[PDB]
Motif scaffolding. Structure first.
Motif, PDB file in Angstrom:
ATOM      1  N   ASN A  33       0.855  -1.180   0.000  1.00  0.00           N
ATOM      2  CA  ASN A  33       0.000   0.000   0.000  1.00  0.00           C
ATOM      3  C   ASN A  33       0.905   1.249   0.000  1.00  0.00           C
ATOM      4  N   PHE A  76      -1.929  -3.489  -2.943  1.00  0.00           N
ATOM      5  CA  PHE A  76      -3.060  -3.243  -2.025  1.00  0.00           C
ATOM      6  C   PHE A  76      -3.377  -1.748  -1.963  1.00  0.00           C
ATOM      7  N   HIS A 103      -6.070  -1.788   2.184  1.00  0.00           N
ATOM      8  CA  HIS A 103      -5.394  -2.414   3.298  1.00  0.00           C
ATOM      9  C   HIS A 103      -3.954  -2.058   3.355  1.00  0.00           C
ATOM     10  N   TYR A 104      -3.474  -1.830   4.562  1.00  0.00           N
ATOM     11  CA  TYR A 104      -2.112  -1.347   4.762  1.00  0.00           C
ATOM     12  C   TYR A 104      -1.098  -2.511   4.851  1.00  0.00           C
ATOM     13  N   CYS A 105      -1.057  -3.247   3.739  1.00  0.00           N
ATOM     14  CA  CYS A 105      -0.356  -4.541   3.660  1.00  0.00           C
ATOM     15  C   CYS A 105       0.761  -4.513   2.619  1.00  0.00           C
ATOM     16  N   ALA A 145     -11.279  -2.569   0.581  1.00  0.00           N
ATOM     17  CA  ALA A 145     -10.922  -3.213   1.858  1.00  0.00           C
ATOM     18  C   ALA A 145     -11.951  -4.256   2.194  1.00  0.00           C
ATOM     19  N   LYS A 161     -12.869  -7.615   4.677  1.00  0.00           N
ATOM     20  CA  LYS A 161     -12.427  -7.963   6.003  1.00  0.00           C
ATOM     21  C   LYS A 161     -11.323  -9.026   5.938  1.00  0.00           C
ATOM     22  N   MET A 162     -10.264  -8.796   6.707  1.00  0.00           N
ATOM     23  CA  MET A 162      -9.128  -9.749   6.706  1.00  0.00           C
ATOM     24  C   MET A 162      -9.387 -10.955   7.599  1.00  0.00           C
ATOM     25  N   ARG A 177       1.026  -6.386   7.878  1.00  0.00           N
ATOM     26  CA  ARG A 177       0.121  -5.231   7.933  1.00  0.00           C
ATOM     27  C   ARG A 177       0.492  -4.386   9.164  1.00  0.00           C
ATOM     28  N   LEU A 226      -0.811  -0.564  10.748  1.00  0.00           N
ATOM     29  CA  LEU A 226      -1.837   0.468  10.581  1.00  0.00           C
ATOM     30  C   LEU A 226      -1.454   1.801  11.119  1.00  0.00           C
TER      31      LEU A 226
END
Length: 189
Positions: A24, A52, A55-57, A95, A97-98, A173, A175
């Motif tokens: 990201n 991504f 999501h901060y992945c 996004a 859900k993870m 990930r 955040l």
């Protein structure tokens, strides 16, 4: 003891290289591709299909469809992080859900001292010793993804007996804005 002797006997050490094309734009991947930090503001990057966008992945470069593999991650005193594996075909744009339903098998830390799995329902994990280094273990054929404290060897969580049908990537990930990066141990070799 058991953890050290076991990992060395049975799992191939993965040399995990963080893949900048996936990250990201809020993430900054180090020069050597072994560390990631979360930036203040998003970078201007391509919107290539691998990246991504919500999501901060970030993923590793290498994926797996077989075998036993492990890597260890220095989380240090970072107050938030989640790590594990995800399917190659997860939704990267928008996004979702993870969760394992959506192709993510991850656990981590939120809000400084709440350890948990990214599942529905959540499993809250009681770690009266906070880990500084986490071992991530993949056994593709048995479908077990395990997490250990990589210093004292104690078990944290296992996702048991998943029938994987896609390639799996290491996923990371972060955040929040924190001074301690997330760092891959190379163990290589």
């Amino acid at each position: 003891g058991a953890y050290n002797e076991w990992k060395k006997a049975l799992f191939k050490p993965a040399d995990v290289i963080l893949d900048p094309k996936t990250a990201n734009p809020i993430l900054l991947v180090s020069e050597d591709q072994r560390s990631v930090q979360r930036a203040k503001e998003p970078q201007d990057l391509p919107d290539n299909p691998e990246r991504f966008n919500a999501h901060y992945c970030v993923l590793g470069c290498e994926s797996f469809i077989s075998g036993r593999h492990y890597w260890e991650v220095e989380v240090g005193d970072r107050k938030e992080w989640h790590i594990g594996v995800c399917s190659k075909n997860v939704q990267r744009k928008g996004a979702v859900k993870m969760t394992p339903e959506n192709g993510f098998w991850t656990m981590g830390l939120t809000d400084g001292n709440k350890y948990r799995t990214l599942t529905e329902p959540r499993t809250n994990l009681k770690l009266p010793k906070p880990p500084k280094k986490v071992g991530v273990f993949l056994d593709y054929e048995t479908g077990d993804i395990s997490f250990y404290n990589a210093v004292d060897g104690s078990h944290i969580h296992t996702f048991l007996d998943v029938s994987f049908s896609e390639a799996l990537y290491p996923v990371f990930r972060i955040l929040t804005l924190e001074p301690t990066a997330l760092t891959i141990c190379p163990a290589l070799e």
